[PDB]
Design a protein around this motif. Structure first.
Motif, PDB file in Angstrom:
ATOM      1  N   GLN A 104       0.859  -1.215   0.000  1.00 38.70           N
ATOM      2  CA  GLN A 104       0.000   0.000   0.000  1.00 38.70           C
ATOM      3  C   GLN A 104       0.883   1.249   0.000  1.00 38.70           C
ATOM      4  OE1 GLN A 104      -4.184   1.270   2.159  1.00 38.70           O
ATOM      5  NE2 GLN A 104      -2.526   0.356   3.353  1.00 38.70           N
ATOM      6  N   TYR A 105       0.567   2.219  -0.862  1.00 34.82           N
ATOM      7  CA  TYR A 105       1.372   3.462  -0.946  1.00 34.82           C
ATOM      8  C   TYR A 105       0.492   4.671  -0.624  1.00 34.82           C
ATOM      9  CZ  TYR A 105       4.631   0.211  -3.101  1.00 34.82           C
ATOM     10  OH  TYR A 105       5.456  -0.850  -3.341  1.00 34.82           O
ATOM     11  N   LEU A 106       0.919   5.477   0.347  1.00 35.35           N
ATOM     12  CA  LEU A 106       0.147   6.682   0.746  1.00 35.35           C
ATOM     13  C   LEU A 106       0.958   7.940   0.427  1.00 35.35           C
ATOM     14  CD1 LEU A 106      -1.980   6.498   3.992  1.00 35.35           C
ATOM     15  CD2 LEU A 106      -2.614   6.903   1.620  1.00 35.35           C
TER      16      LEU A 106
ATOM     17  N   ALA B  20       2.941   7.446  -5.329  1.00 35.87           N
ATOM     18  CA  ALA B  20       2.316   7.788  -4.028  1.00 35.87           C
ATOM     19  C   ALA B  20       1.694   9.183  -4.144  1.00 35.87           C
ATOM     20  CB  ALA B  20       3.342   7.738  -2.924  1.00 35.87           C
ATOM     21  N   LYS B  21       0.940   9.615  -3.128  1.00 37.50           N
ATOM     22  CA  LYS B  21       0.256  10.935  -3.197  1.00 37.50           C
ATOM     23  C   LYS B  21       1.240  12.052  -2.832  1.00 37.50           C
ATOM     24  CE  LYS B  21      -3.628   8.595  -3.810  1.00 37.50           C
ATOM     25  NZ  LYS B  21      -4.350   8.611  -5.102  1.00 37.50           N
ATOM     26  N   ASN B  38      -5.190  13.038   0.315  1.00 32.73           N
ATOM     27  CA  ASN B  38      -5.445  11.799   1.044  1.00 32.73           C
ATOM     28  C   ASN B  38      -6.923  11.428   0.949  1.00 32.73           C
ATOM     29  OD1 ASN B  38      -4.853   9.566   2.669  1.00 32.73           O
ATOM     30  ND2 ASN B  38      -5.101  10.715   4.586  1.00 32.73           N
ATOM     31  N   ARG B  41     -10.242   8.084   5.114  1.00 36.03           N
ATOM     32  CA  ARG B  41     -10.616   8.806   6.322  1.00 36.03           C
ATOM     33  C   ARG B  41      -9.920   8.280   7.568  1.00 36.03           C
ATOM     34  NH1 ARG B  41     -16.565   6.290   7.950  1.00 36.03           N
ATOM     35  NH2 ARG B  41     -16.097   4.158   7.232  1.00 36.03           N
ATOM     36  N   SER B  42      -9.410   7.042   7.465  1.00 37.37           N
ATOM     37  CA  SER B  42      -8.750   6.369   8.613  1.00 37.37           C
ATOM     38  C   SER B  42      -7.233   6.556   8.536  1.00 37.37           C
ATOM     39  CB  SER B  42      -9.100   4.905   8.622  1.00 37.37           C
ATOM     40  OG  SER B  42     -10.508   4.724   8.650  1.00 37.37           O
ATOM     41  N   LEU B  43      -6.629   6.179   7.403  1.00 38.07           N
ATOM     42  CA  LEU B  43      -5.149   6.248   7.272  1.00 38.07           C
ATOM     43  C   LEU B  43      -4.738   7.710   7.091  1.00 38.07           C
ATOM     44  CD1 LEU B  43      -4.645   3.201   4.876  1.00 38.07           C
ATOM     45  CD2 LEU B  43      -4.796   3.235   7.368  1.00 38.07           C
ATOM     46  N   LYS B  45      -1.361  10.834   6.830  1.00 37.29           N
ATOM     47  CA  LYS B  45       0.031  11.092   6.478  1.00 37.29           C
ATOM     48  C   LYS B  45       0.578  12.350   7.143  1.00 37.29           C
ATOM     49  CE  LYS B  45       0.628  10.914   2.259  1.00 37.29           C
ATOM     50  NZ  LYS B  45       0.782  11.446   0.888  1.00 37.29           N
ATOM     51  N   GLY B  59       4.846   7.830   0.845  1.00 43.09           N
ATOM     52  CA  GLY B  59       5.459   6.571   0.378  1.00 43.09           C
ATOM     53  C   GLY B  59       4.846   5.392   1.108  1.00 43.09           C
ATOM     54  N   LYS B  60       5.422   4.192   0.993  1.00 42.01           N
ATOM     55  CA  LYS B  60       4.771   2.984   1.570  1.00 42.01           C
ATOM     56  C   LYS B  60       4.313   3.310   2.993  1.00 42.01           C
ATOM     57  CE  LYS B  60       5.823  -2.004   1.563  1.00 42.01           C
ATOM     58  NZ  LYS B  60       4.414  -2.187   1.145  1.00 42.01           N
ATOM     59  N   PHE B  61       3.035   3.058   3.305  1.00 45.78           N
ATOM     60  CA  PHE B  61       2.500   3.508   4.619  1.00 45.78           C
ATOM     61  C   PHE B  61       3.041   2.666   5.779  1.00 45.78           C
ATOM     62  CE2 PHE B  61      -0.936   2.633   7.750  1.00 45.78           C
ATOM     63  CZ  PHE B  61      -1.081   3.873   8.327  1.00 45.78           C
TER      64      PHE B  61
ATOM     65  N   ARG D  90     -11.227  -0.207  13.312  1.00 48.64           N
ATOM     66  CA  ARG D  90     -10.162   0.455  12.574  1.00 48.64           C
ATOM     67  C   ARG D  90      -8.781  -0.001  13.039  1.00 48.64           C
ATOM     68  NH1 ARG D  90      -7.236   4.114  14.233  1.00 48.64           N
ATOM     69  NH2 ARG D  90      -6.076   5.627  12.946  1.00 48.64           N
ATOM     70  N   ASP D 142     -11.488   0.848   2.275  1.00 49.12           N
ATOM     71  CA  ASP D 142     -12.696   1.183   3.025  1.00 49.12           C
ATOM     72  C   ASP D 142     -13.912   1.038   2.127  1.00 49.12           C
ATOM     73  OD1 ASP D 142     -14.637   2.249   4.835  1.00 49.12           O
ATOM     74  OD2 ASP D 142     -13.096   3.484   5.769  1.00 49.12           O
TER      75      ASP D 142
END
Lengths: 106, 215, 223, 215, 215, 215, 215
Positions: A104-106, B20-21, B38, B41-43, B45, B59-61, D90, D142
């Protein structure tokens, strides 16, 4: 330096992988092909609208349209160009590209 | 083989940051502003690290949240062992640099992450906001005005280069940051501030209807 | 030492005296025994000074640490539990004479009725806790006199201000009947400390207001 | 190549999930409904995790039951350490993601499992059911309405997309779920609910004659 | 072939030191002077080690700061175990001589660092400043006049060879050191001294306006 | 396979010792004389081991100083555990042989070192000086007159073969040793003696002006 | 190829089970009947596990006896930790499945074993006998009537398919089982029952003259 003349993306290992534009590969054969494409476009224009002339817009469009037909350069240059790209950068070229379910990438 | 073994890991890390964002952090009149793209709503940055020290990552969470947790751990252990006003953004940035370097030359895979540690002055105090960027190499850079992380950083960095204005209010800096980030509604933005005016805990999220009014 | 806490319609108030002794000797004239551990709680600690200040500090750290890791404060129940576990942890040292008892005031934002979201929680040396329902609590050597004062004065509590007045008075009577509890020092200008928690968080009462209340009480007693 | 090895691992995990039965979870008026295609009477793919948090899985039984057990362990240790109302769906989802990000990159064989963590509101409370889906890579999604796991997900997902209706009763949601799952009697179905109306423990199995009446 | 690997380790370390800024240390009337080319305001390449022992380094930041920390640790443990006047620059140099050898032979990659340990006499005492250079090989060279570390050392070493004068004042030695280093303002220089005249702690940084006056 | 490694281990160790300074130790009237060619003022190749036992070495400094330290450790632990007069040069030589053999067979790289352990009689006692040479593999040889270590040993060993005289005074043995070593002033010589006439601690350095007078 | 490597590990285990004798277990009126072809008098392939839980196996003796012992260990630790009536055949079967899967993936050689766990109801209670078969990989199957393990299972399984009768007496089920097993005297048969009529310990061997009378 504008991203309108993008030719290749070199995946330098150290990151900041560099974008090689047409300026990095303007060989004489490429120049002749560009001018011939512009001449063909001018011929098409004079046959379409009638006026007997060559437009600067023909050359300007041939600049961006030359890459539409690859000139055998992308992914197939000699190791001399790759060496020079590496020597200027100082890093080995892992891969070159033309211009999912893995974590997973954020 | 020396550089050849290290560089191959670097290519993988750079590729991950690119997929990635984008996050931006910039200085404004009341402190520092984090604006990230983003959807969830949960994860998150963007995070509080200590009283006046904030943190953004891209990058990778599983990796930058691991660092988020480690940094929280560090900061609280120091603050308790010595005092709260002794933990500084500079120490935190340095620890992240050491840790990302050690992962780069030892672990199997390099952390495809890019960090930004931010600090503002204490309450009733005067001092310029400090931004540090820590890369996957272990490299650390001191930024005077703004940091851009993740995705394609060139267009956002340039748009910010034209729009940036020191001592911009909260609303202006939010407009500039969202505009340069576009180069998105409240349902796709994560926005928080390091408000220098708060007495102790400076970090403060701006969500929902208040965010709606600001943008 | 003596620390009182009382609910009022809409909030909670918590006040504490200032004296610290060694035997019959008055050693500290301005100790602060009531802390703001977080935006919705306040913690008084009676007992050994070291153990007290450390409890308060470390508890505040832990509340805020979980808040930073999880992105949301614990429920009032979780906070109660952590404080209780700390207190239970000090039990051996408390039997060695290092006893410290905390009194925890909080404003539950998740409660159904806002007018009764105030919360007072008391602890013994063995970590057991109890949620007070008769509207007030106290801890310390003067606690019995303070409670017996508030039992009579509590019908007068109708808002934040009257509740503060009643708190200060209860302290005055604790000090009046016990020598380890300091009363308002009019000479040096040292007054009890007070914290008010309501829907908007926790704020320290500024000293001037406690001063005016103390002087009202003193003028009332002397005739 | 390094990229090829990761792609090969992804293919092996996908093949294992594809070689399995299908599970669905969807929101309905009284909470969340789990309907799985399960022939055995002893081996189960739906489970209580905590008071209001349920769990469904699809893949390799020993592994998703390993995760089932680990999650139970986690939730109870938290609930006891802090309080029951502090454990949320969560957190659980996040722990499973970290675990499926560590197993996939560190163990010999990735877990061939697909997880769904579900949560409903507490008793007398009002809040929308939350569904999360954790993939074998460690990504978490989600979901607003329904999750489909294991086997041929796309045909079942297409049917649910047409038949789904918010606030459908228990019988309607059961008909919709069994119908879309067919795209089976009480002797080949595992059915359970997260009934939001229960005072504390929301999970409740529907088996035998009661299941017979409902379908 | 360990010989091929050792030969490439030595080349890799040499390239890393060359790929870095330059530091000089020279003896002057009041003790020893460290002048480094350093743009950052937080990251430092000159440090107090013990009461009369200073330290400069050039190479990879995280590694020579690892050595900085180790040396501080060592010196303080000795000073407390025996006494302050027993810790000498010679012991410190020797410990970094053996640690860099052990690292160079046993760790995956050799440290890319070059160290200089400096010592002056105690207060009211008379003795010549001692400079030692420790290389990544672990070799320790006793220098009588000045040490040059990192980058291209030849032109700086020669310029110092022509300009050096024993018993030069603080301002002259600063001019000579900056001049030979050029072969930069207060915003790009890290300058400190081992002032032999201080009663106990000899190390003393020269920054800001005082540095401005000196140069 | 082990023997082929041993052939590589023989040459590497030999080449390293050849890349070093030459040391000589010879018997004279008052005991034993160590004369080494040593430019540094801090790094030493001659050392006291115990009351009447001295030590000289030639090779990589870090490795024979490791042995120096180990031998000191050993001798003192024995002397305290039993008594001072029980520790003998013979035990020490034997320990060095065992340790250099174990290093030569078990460690990655063989210690490129050559040792000489010397012993004289106790005070008021009569007995001939004993010299032992321990080589890199663990071999130990008993020498009656002199030991030559490091560099090119042939010309020095032959010059000593012609010049040596038993019961030569301190000055004559110094002249013979310096002469055969040349085959250097007080600024390039490390000279010490195992003076048999001292009451307890026999080792004694001869430096500076006293050395100047002797040579 | 991972699938082909698993096929080699599957073929080797299958080869071992075939290179052996055959065991059958079937339900009859008084409980469950185990009939194995066993020449030795000391080595046994049928065993009590707990009060009402029996166990049969086929393959490599040392390994299925290792499992026999592990299962005994497990069952008694549970029974003591909770209570006797809490240990069920289902738990045991599940543990064997987890363990044979872990062995099949992690150990060097897979256990060439095939297990059958049997359970009957308690005394004065009514419930159908349960048979589970656990294979070498960890797979577990719920059998309603009979299990056949080891050797060539097809002819025995078919003969049982024609001859089986629910609620057959002990003698009839013995005749059916020996007949289908032939597809042998008291000197080559291991026969035991899980007699549901016993008060506590249901397992009971039928040997010697009593076995002689029954067959």
């Amino acid at each position: 330096e504008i991203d309108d003349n993008r030719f290749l993306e070199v995946t330098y290992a150290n990151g900041d992988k560099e974008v090689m534009y047409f300026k990095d590969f303007n060989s004489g054969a490429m120049i002749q092909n560009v001018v011939d494409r512009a001449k063909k476009n001018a011929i098409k224009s004079v046959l379409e609208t009638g006026q007997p002339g060559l437009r600067i817009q023909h050359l300007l469009d041939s600049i961006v349209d030359e890459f539409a037909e690859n000139e055998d350069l992308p992914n197939t240059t000699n190791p001399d160009d790759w060496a020079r790209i590496s020597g200027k950068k100082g890093e080995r070229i892992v891969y070159i590209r033309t211009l999912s379910n893995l974590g997973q990438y954020l | 083989s020396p550089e050849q073994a290290m560089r191959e890991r670097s290519e993988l890390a750079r590729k991950g940051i690119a997929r990635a964002k984008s996050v931006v952090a910039l200085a404004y009149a009341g402190g520092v502003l984090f604006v990230a793209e983003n959807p969830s709503r949960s994860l998150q940055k963007i995070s509080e690290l200590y009283d006046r020290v904030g943190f953004a990552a891209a990058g990778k969470f599983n990796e930058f949240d691991n660092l988020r947790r480690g940094g929280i751990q560090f900061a609280d252990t120091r603050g308790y062992a010595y005092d709260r006003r002794d933990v500084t953004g500079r120490q935190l940035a340095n620890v992240y640099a050491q840790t990302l370097g050690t992962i780069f030359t030892e672990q199997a895979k390099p952390y495809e992450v890019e960090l930004c540690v931010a600090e503002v002055a204490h309450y009733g105090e005067t001092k310029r906001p400090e931004l540090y960027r820590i890369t996957y190499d272990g490299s650390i850079a001191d930024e005077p005005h703004f940091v851009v992380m993740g995705g394609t950083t060139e267009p956002i960095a340039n748009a910010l280069k034209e729009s940036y204005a020191e001592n911009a209010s909260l609303t202006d800096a939010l407009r500039i940051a969202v505009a340069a980030l576009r180069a998105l509604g409240v349902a796709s933005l994560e926005v928080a501030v390091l408000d220098a005016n708060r007495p102790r805990r400076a970090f403060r999220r701006i969500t929902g209807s208040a965010l709606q009014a600001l943008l | 030492t003596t620390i009182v806490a009382l609910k009022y319609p809409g909030g909670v108030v918590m006040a504490g005296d200032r004296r610290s002794t060694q035997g019959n000797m008055i050693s500290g004239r301005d100790v602060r025994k009531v802390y703001i551990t977080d935006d919705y709680t306040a913690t008084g600690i009676a007992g050994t000074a070291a153990v007290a200040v450390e409890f308060a500090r470390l508890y505040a750290v832990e509340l805020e640490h979980y808040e930073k890791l999880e992105g949301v404060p614990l429920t009032f129940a979780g906070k109660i539990n952590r404080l209780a576990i700390m207190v239970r942890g000090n039990l051996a040292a408390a039997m060695q004479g290092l006893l410290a008892l905390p009194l925890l005031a909080g404003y539950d934002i998740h409660a159904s009725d806002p007018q009764s979201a105030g919360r007072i929680v008391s602890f013994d040396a063995a970590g057991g806790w109890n949620i007070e329902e008769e509207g007030y609590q106290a801890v310390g050597s003067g606690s019995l006199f303070a409670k017996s004062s508030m039992k009579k004065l509590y019908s007068q509590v109708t808002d934040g201000d009257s509740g503060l007045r009643v708190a200060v008075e209860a302290l005055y009577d604790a000090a009046d009947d016990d020598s380890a509890t300091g009363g308002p020092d009019l000479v040096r200008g040292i007054f009890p400390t007070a914290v008010i928690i309501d829907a908007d968080g926790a704020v320290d009462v500024p000293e001037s207001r406690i001063a005016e209340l103390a002087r009202a009480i003193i003028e009332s007693r002397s005739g």
